[PDB]
Amino acid sequence: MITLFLILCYFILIFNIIVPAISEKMRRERAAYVNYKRLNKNFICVDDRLFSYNFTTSGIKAKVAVDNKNVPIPCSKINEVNNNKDVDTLYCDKDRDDIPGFARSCYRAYSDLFFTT
Amino acid sequence: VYKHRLIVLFEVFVVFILIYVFFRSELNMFFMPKRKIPDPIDRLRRANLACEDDKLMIYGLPWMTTQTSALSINSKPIVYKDCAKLLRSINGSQPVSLNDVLRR
Amino acid sequence: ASLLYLILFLLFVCISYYFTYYPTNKLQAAVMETDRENAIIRQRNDEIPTRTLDTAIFTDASTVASAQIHLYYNSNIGKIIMSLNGKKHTFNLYDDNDIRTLLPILLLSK
Amino acid sequence: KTSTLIFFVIILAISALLLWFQTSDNPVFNELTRYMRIKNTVNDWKSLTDSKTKLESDRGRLLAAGKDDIFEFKCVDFGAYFIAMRLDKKTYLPQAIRRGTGDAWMVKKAAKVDPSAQQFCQYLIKHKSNNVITCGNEMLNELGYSGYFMSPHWCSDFSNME
Amino acid sequence: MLVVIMFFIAFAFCSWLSYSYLRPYISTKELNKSR
Amino acid sequence: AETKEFKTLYNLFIDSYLQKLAQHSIPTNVTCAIHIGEVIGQFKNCALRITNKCMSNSRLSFTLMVESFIEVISLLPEKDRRRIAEEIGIDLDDVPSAVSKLEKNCNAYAEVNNIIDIQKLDIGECSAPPGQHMLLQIVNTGSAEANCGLQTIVKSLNKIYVPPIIENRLPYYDPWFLVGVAIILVIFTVAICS
């Protein structure tokens, strides 16, 4: 009856580890988003790119600022970037390969979000 | 009983769905090692100095395979007849690559 | 099968161990990834010293002089700043002109 | 066979009870999980300090370019107090004049423009400069905090301003 | 068969508890609708 | 439970104003008082802070208040900081050491003394991230007009939207039904096997 043992194992795993893990991850990311939007707003500067963090159904997500021709916006003009709320944003969930080190910048953005919050 | 195996397969499938929906990025970072950013000086390590006639020359350039003359401070061509002796008194007769320079 | 059951149990153990003793959120996993990445970055970057390194320097097209320089390499923009006589000049490792300017000053270090 | 099914049902019921206690707002489970969480967070403090100190070292190396005046003691004004600080020649981290065995010397200001505070900070620069404290790992090993993750603080404010 | 229906009942009840627990987070529309 | 204060824009403004008042503190012969008839708090992590400052020089009080407000909105986006500035009645281009519209509006409290009298006070819901508390302040100052400015700026900063922490934990009631059903179904499977 090893199979019933495995069934019990996976049932306990899911409903006593993964679901509380989902709740804990949502709570931590929501707290980080709250501590981020309580002072900071719109985009912030990380690795010469611009990232913002928004909370959705499946956790927090970082979107990077790009111009019309899918080029990341240089940090120097974040001023006007805060003036224009219709600037193009690309999500970090999709691994888009045209930008060199896009996932690198996304990971550093998440790390900076953790450090600031 | 095949029903028990079906149930445990449903267990592992729903575990995978839960991981993919929520913990996709975390597991992707932890278990899958991402490519490292290329090092331009690692590419430049193969470069070495020699003499193109009476001018300085850089062999072993993957950035530009064509013949290029080394630029001085004011971004102008370098033309010394004695540059070979200077290379011999610093690197040696053999053209020392930038990898050995970094290793120094 | 017995092998399938053993594999399933091992996968159980691995997943439970990860979910208990490892981060389960994007922030902390990204912090660990950034830690490893920055460790590699610095392992490569520390090969460039900031000490006073003697080298032959070409102020013009027919002049040469021996002098001490300082070198600082950064990977955010991938450039080397060379310090001479209290003045710092930045040379990119991706631009052809900057590479042609910087390679002789590095390969001719006495 | 029968015993196996009975124990299967019993273990499923135990797991259901554990899930009920986990999801619900039970004070006992909350106390236990908060105990564990506090212990884990205090454990992770050290790694967080190391990472932040190292990143601040990189940003100090990047910032201290073409500016030899930032390497010497200056009386930085923080709106309410003066601190005589600089950047260390080795770690490239903010290093200020230390007050005994405590933190950096904070010359309290009685007004927006307080000449006496500036005069006393200069006096410390010229006389009592042998005792210094640096943000990062020395700060952690001496006073218990890294200087970062603390607001307001001279390390964080100096990193944000510069 | 009996173990199958036992598993079905347990999984249904535990999934109901998990869904009721996670509704505020898995349904962000619920949280943003009520401010 | 010793929990950290959840920093928030109006809290930062109040604390900066209080620090500026303390660092320019001057003795005065005027009596400044707080009298609250009832204080009711029934929600967890609802910290209450009753700080009783009073500076007789109300002109300097508005100067420091405007300076602290300007330093606070130095981190907001430009459009939001500016619109909140006209909503309050303070202009950034004007020096803080100048009489603004807000001060002119609040001069109507010059005759009344510097006492804060509240008949009854109740603290509402305070949703804070775990490990932190939502702290509410009742700050008195040496003039009722400085108080006027204080509460109007506090309300204006409260008008902003800060995302709330949502509680996903279900209400807990003693679950004897689950164990009862488990026992009944154990008896059921015992009978089935037999």
Side-chain angles (χ1 to χ4, degrees):
Chain A
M1 294 298 103
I2 305 193
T3 302
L4 302 188
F5 168 63
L6 288 182
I7 295 181
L8 280 177
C9 282
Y10 276 113
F11 193 93
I12 292 166
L13 160 64
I14 299 159
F15 287 99
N16 291 118
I17 290 192
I18 278 183
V19 162
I22 289 164
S23 164
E24 184 46 48
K25 181 263 288 181
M26 294 296 173
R27 201 169 90 157
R28 276 173 193 155
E29 302 198 320
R30 175 100 197 157
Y33 170 98
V34 161
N35 292 294
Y36 166 78
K37 297 291 181 68
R38 64 158 165 117
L39 281 71
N40 293 77
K41 285 98 175 182
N42 190 359
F43 294 166
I44 63 170
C45 190
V46 160
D47 283 7
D48 313 303
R49 280 76 178 272
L50 278 298
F51 290 98
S52 69
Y53 315 116
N54 56 352
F55 183 76
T56 58
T57 64
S58 59
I60 201 164
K61 273 143 193 179
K63 38 196 180 73
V64 66
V66 290
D67 59 1
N68 298 1
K69 329 163 190 174
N70 55 47
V71 175
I73 296 177
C75 183
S76 62
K77 64 182 181 293
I78 186 62
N79 296 115
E80 65 93 16
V81 175
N82 289 298
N83 279 322
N84 189 359
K85 300 188 175 180
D86 295 353
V87 297
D88 278 333
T89 80
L90 294 175
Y91 270 58
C92 278
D93 310 301
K94 43 175 176 176
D95 195 6
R96 181 66 179 86
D97 298 356
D98 51 1
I99 318 180
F102 182 45
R104 261 193 67 238
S105 296
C106 293
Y107 298 160
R108 196 146 289 121
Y110 291 126
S111 172
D112 271 353
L113 177 53
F114 180 59
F115 288 164
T116 60
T117 71
Chain B
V1 176
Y2 272 29
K3 282 92 182 178
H4 311 160
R5 306 176 201 188
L6 162 66
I7 292 182
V8 73
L9 286 191
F10 166 82
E11 290 291 328
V12 69
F13 172 76
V14 68
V15 174
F16 277 166
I17 300 299
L18 290 172
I19 284 185
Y20 164 87
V21 163
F22 303 100
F23 310 97
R24 200 186 333 177
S25 60
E26 298 96 306
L27 277 297
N28 205 3
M29 300 181 216
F30 178 84
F31 267 104
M32 295 296 172
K34 191 221 196 191
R35 298 284 75 78
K36 70 166 285 288
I37 182 166
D39 189 5
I41 191 166
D42 273 1
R43 297 294 87 193
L44 276 174
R45 286 164 163 218
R46 308 154 185 185
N48 62 6
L49 285 183
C51 286
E52 183 186 358
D53 314 299
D54 300 353
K55 303 183 180 182
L56 194 42
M57 184 64 204
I58 313 170
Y59 290 164
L61 293 174
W63 305 86
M64 294 299 291
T65 301
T66 71
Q67 290 188 356
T68 74
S69 47
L71 296 186
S72 64
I73 293 301
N74 57 9
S75 300
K76 295 185 188 179
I78 296 169
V79 191
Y80 316 143
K81 307 176 184 178
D82 319 298
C83 184
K85 314 174 185 176
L86 260 57
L87 271 168
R88 199 163 187 182
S89 72
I90 296 162
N91 288 0
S93 60
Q94 305 174 359
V96 160
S97 65
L98 195 64
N99 195 358
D100 192 79
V101 167
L102 300 189
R103 285 172 180 176
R104 288 165 182 172
Chain C
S2 179
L3 202 47
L4 180 79
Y5 292 158
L6 171 61
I7 287 308
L8 266 287
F9 174 70
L10 277 176
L11 171 66
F12 176 75
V13 161
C14 176
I15 297 183
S16 182
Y17 179 81
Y18 174 85
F19 269 86
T20 307
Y21 295 114
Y22 282 141
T24 56
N25 53 1
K26 298 176 190 288
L27 282 71
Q28 279 175 355
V31 174
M32 293 178 70
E33 174 74 24
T34 298
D35 278 3
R36 185 179 67 189
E37 171 158 293
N38 270 7
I40 298 182
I41 291 290
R42 298 181 186 179
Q43 175 198 302
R44 292 186 292 112
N45 278 359
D46 289 1
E47 203 182 6
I48 310 305
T50 65
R51 327 150 193 166
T52 58
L53 170 63
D54 201 5
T55 188
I57 311 186
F58 312 120
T59 51
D60 215 341
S62 52
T63 55
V64 64
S66 184
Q68 294 166 349
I69 71 178
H70 316 81
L71 295 165
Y72 151 73
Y73 176 44
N74 62 6
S75 293
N76 297 323
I77 61 171
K79 310 200 182 177
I80 287 176
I81 291 175
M82 183 277 288
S83 297
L84 181 63
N85 291 343
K87 184 63 177 178
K88 302 189 176 182
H89 294 89
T90 314
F91 308 99
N92 196 7
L93 300 193
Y94 301 97
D95 194 283
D96 194 59
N97 291 317
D98 297 357
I99 279 172
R100 291 164 63 178
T101 309
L102 182 69
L103 280 190
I105 201 71
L106 304 191
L107 287 145
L108 288 155
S109 51
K110 313 170 172 177
Chain D
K1 173 55 72 180
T2 307
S3 61
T4 300
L5 271 43
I6 294 158
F7 287 131
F8 195 89
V9 174
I10 289 177
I11 293 170
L12 277 185
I14 294 299
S15 167
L17 292 174
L18 185 51
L19 166 74
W20 191 275
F21 276 84
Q22 271 173 338
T23 61
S24 68
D25 190 5
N26 199 304
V28 163
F29 173 83
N30 290 2
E31 295 293 328
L32 307 180
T33 197
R34 192 152 93 243
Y35 202 71
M36 293 297 102
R37 196 165 303 127
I38 296 156
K39 296 200 157 194
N40 279 118
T41 291
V42 179
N43 175 234
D44 300 351
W45 279 359
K46 191 59 186 98
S47 301
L48 261 57
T49 298
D50 290 330
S51 304
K52 196 43 172 303
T53 297
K54 299 274 160 71
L55 183 63
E56 279 275 354
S57 178
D58 289 333
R59 292 180 292 173
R61 207 197 324 281
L62 188 152
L63 162 73
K67 291 179 189 174
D68 297 355
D69 55 357
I70 322 293
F71 265 60
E72 294 293 328
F73 273 125
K74 299 294 187 291
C75 286
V76 176
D77 187 9
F78 284 84
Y81 50 89
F82 275 77
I83 297 170
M85 70 181 48
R86 74 184 165 179
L87 280 71
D88 216 353
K89 205 170 305 299
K90 306 142 70 52
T91 79
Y92 292 165
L93 297 163
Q95 165 180 62
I97 281 183
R98 188 184 194 184
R99 164 192 204 136
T101 42
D103 211 355
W105 187 265
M106 312 181 161
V107 186
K108 182 67 182 294
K109 279 204 317 183
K112 182 67 181 294
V113 177
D114 188 4
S116 182
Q118 177 167 352
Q119 308 292 318
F120 188 52
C121 172
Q122 298 171 17
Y123 171 79
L124 287 190
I125 287 185
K126 305 146 98 158
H127 281 263
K128 325 191 82 193
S129 58
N130 55 1
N131 189 358
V132 297
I133 193 66
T134 71
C135 310
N137 295 117
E138 183 178 1
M139 186 66 73
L140 182 72
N141 289 309
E142 293 293 328
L143 302 164
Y145 43 72
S146 179
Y148 322 109
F149 316 125
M150 185 179 288
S151 178
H153 200 262
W154 51 285
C155 315
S156 62
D157 291 318
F158 184 83
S159 77
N160 295 0
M161 182 179 72
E162 300 282 356
Chain E
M1 186 81 237
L2 180 66
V3 64
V4 171
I5 62 172
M6 183 64 205
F7 159 79
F8 154 65
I9 296 166
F11 203 99
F13 176 67
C14 281
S15 291
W16 173 68
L17 293 175
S18 299
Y19 201 101
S20 66
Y21 182 50
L22 292 177
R23 270 206 264 271
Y25 285 130
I26 319 301
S27 294
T28 300
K29 65 179 72 66
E30 187 183 308
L31 68 92
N32 57 52
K33 181 180 184 183
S34 53
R35 305 175 185 178
Chain F
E2 285 165 15
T3 61
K4 260 173 190 155
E5 184 213 310
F6 178 80
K7 268 314 199 172
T8 294
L9 270 186
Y10 37 90
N11 285 127
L12 280 72
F13 157 67
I14 292 175
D15 270 345
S16 307
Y17 182 42
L18 288 182
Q19 198 270 321
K20 288 184 185 63
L21 287 191
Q23 80 157 331
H24 303 70
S25 55
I26 185 77
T28 178
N29 299 300
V30 61
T31 301
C32 62
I34 308 186
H35 186 273
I36 309 184
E38 311 283 287
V39 182
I40 314 294
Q42 41 188 60
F43 281 33
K44 65 179 72 66
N45 285 30
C46 282
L48 177 78
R49 183 177 178 180
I50 311 186
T51 298
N52 183 13
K53 296 290 181 68
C54 62
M55 185 180 288
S56 53
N57 195 4
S58 176
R59 180 66 178 86
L60 183 63
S61 293
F62 290 101
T63 300
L64 303 184
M65 185 180 288
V66 171
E67 193 205 330
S68 299
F69 166 61
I70 287 295
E71 303 318 288
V72 159
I73 56 159
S74 80
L75 61 84
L76 270 76
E78 40 264 25
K79 296 183 290 294
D80 290 331
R81 70 180 69 187
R82 183 64 59 84
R83 272 69 174 175
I84 296 169
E86 290 90 7
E87 289 149 45
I88 292 173
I90 301 299
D91 296 331
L92 291 64
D93 56 356
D94 308 338
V95 62
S97 66
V99 168
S100 297
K101 297 296 289 183
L102 183 63
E103 167 148 10
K104 291 174 70 175
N105 276 287
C106 285
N107 294 116
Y109 298 89
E111 294 89 5
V112 289
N113 55 3
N114 48 24
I115 201 171
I116 283 285
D117 193 356
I118 311 180
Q119 309 311 310
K120 183 178 184 293
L121 188 151
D122 170 36
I123 298 169
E125 203 274 345
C126 55
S127 190
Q132 283 147 291
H133 62 251
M134 294 299 291
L135 188 152
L136 183 137
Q137 298 203 236
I138 308 158
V139 172
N140 175 74
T141 303
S143 66
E145 63 183 1
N147 298 358
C148 175
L150 199 66
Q151 290 90 22
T152 187
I153 296 188
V154 164
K155 293 182 183 293
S156 295
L157 275 296
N158 272 296
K159 201 174 295 296
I160 76 167
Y161 163 72
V162 161
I165 301 299
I166 61 171
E167 182 65 26
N168 57 351
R169 284 202 304 275
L170 314 167
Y172 171 69
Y173 61 86
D174 194 359
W176 292 98
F177 81 112
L178 189 154
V179 297
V181 166
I183 291 171
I184 293 172
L185 183 61
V186 160
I187 294 177
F188 191 34
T189 175
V190 159
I192 287 184
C193 284
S194 175

